[PDB]
């Protein structure tokens, strides 16, 4: 996020980090329940990648994070890689996340839900702070 | 990438207004946000765009793509969750 601010730790409990086997953070995700994560199709997640729940400071070894294995990757069949449209993948976890004060689910909207232009929303992540 | 989690508040735009920046790349299953002095950027992909509805945070967008330089004056493009929810529920239900 460019020009964002540090969040209060544990305050966005559905936010997960998608890391590869080398431990490199490559994409974020959101817990929708204990066994499922939603992320972007273009992240190219494989079952060799890990979902890290409960983390605030990735430079810290004393946080009680949950490193969860991915059982199955469900790329939306409508995803179009040429236009990046319908950019959603669901990850089914092999081990359920354990909900706590720092690990919990975000709600999903109704198909019929209305979110108006002008509404102030929030976005979170560990992406670049500068380009 | 930063070590600690970042956050930012940013406004939703309409698709019509987004098209002014992005043109025909903006599809129905996309939603834009930002162009407000902040921007999602590389490594943010896949993460949430949440809006408070009736007191609870709701997933409205999934960080997707935008400016190659993460420009704070151009809107970021997010996957529009309301257009994809039916697929999520069908998926969870069958698995």
């Amino acid at each position: 996020i460019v020009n964002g601010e540090e969040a209060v730790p544990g305050s966005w409990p559905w936010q997960v980090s998608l890391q590869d086997k080398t431990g490199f953070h490559f994409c974020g995700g959101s817990l929708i329940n204990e066994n499922w994560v939603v992320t972007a199709a273009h992240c190219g997640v494989t079952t060799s990648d890990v979902v890290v729940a409960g983390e605030f400071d990735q430079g810290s070894s004393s946080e009680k994070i949950q490193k969860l294995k991915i059982a199955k990757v469900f790329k939306n069949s409508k995803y179009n890689s040429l236009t990046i449209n319908n950019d959603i993948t669901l990850l089914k976890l092999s081990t359920a996340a354990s909900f706590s004060q720092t690990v919990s689910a975000v709600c999903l909207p109704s198909a019929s839900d209305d979110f108006a232009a002008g509404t102030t929303c929030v976005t979170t992540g560990w992406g670049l702070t500068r380009y | 990438t930063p070590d600690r989690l970042q956050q930012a508040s940013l406004p939703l735009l309409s698709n019509t207004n987004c098209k002014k920046y992005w043109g025909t790349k903006i599809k129905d299953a996309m939603i834009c946000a930002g162009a407000s002095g902040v921007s999602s950027c590389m490594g943010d992909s896949g993460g949430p765009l949440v809006c408070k509805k009736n007191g609870a945070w709701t997933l409205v967008g999934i960080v997707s793509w935008g400016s190659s330089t993460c420009s704070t004056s151009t809107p970021g493009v997010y996957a529009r969750v309301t257009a994809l929810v039916n697929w999520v529920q069908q998926t969870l239900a069958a698995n």
């Binding site: 305050s11 004060q101 689910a105 975000v106 | 609870a56 709701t58």
Partner: peptide, 10 residues
């Protein structure tokens, strides 16, 4: 869902 135990501060 959507109700964190630790409240965010914006």
């Amino acid at each position: 869902c959507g109700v964190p135990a630790i409240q965010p501060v914006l």
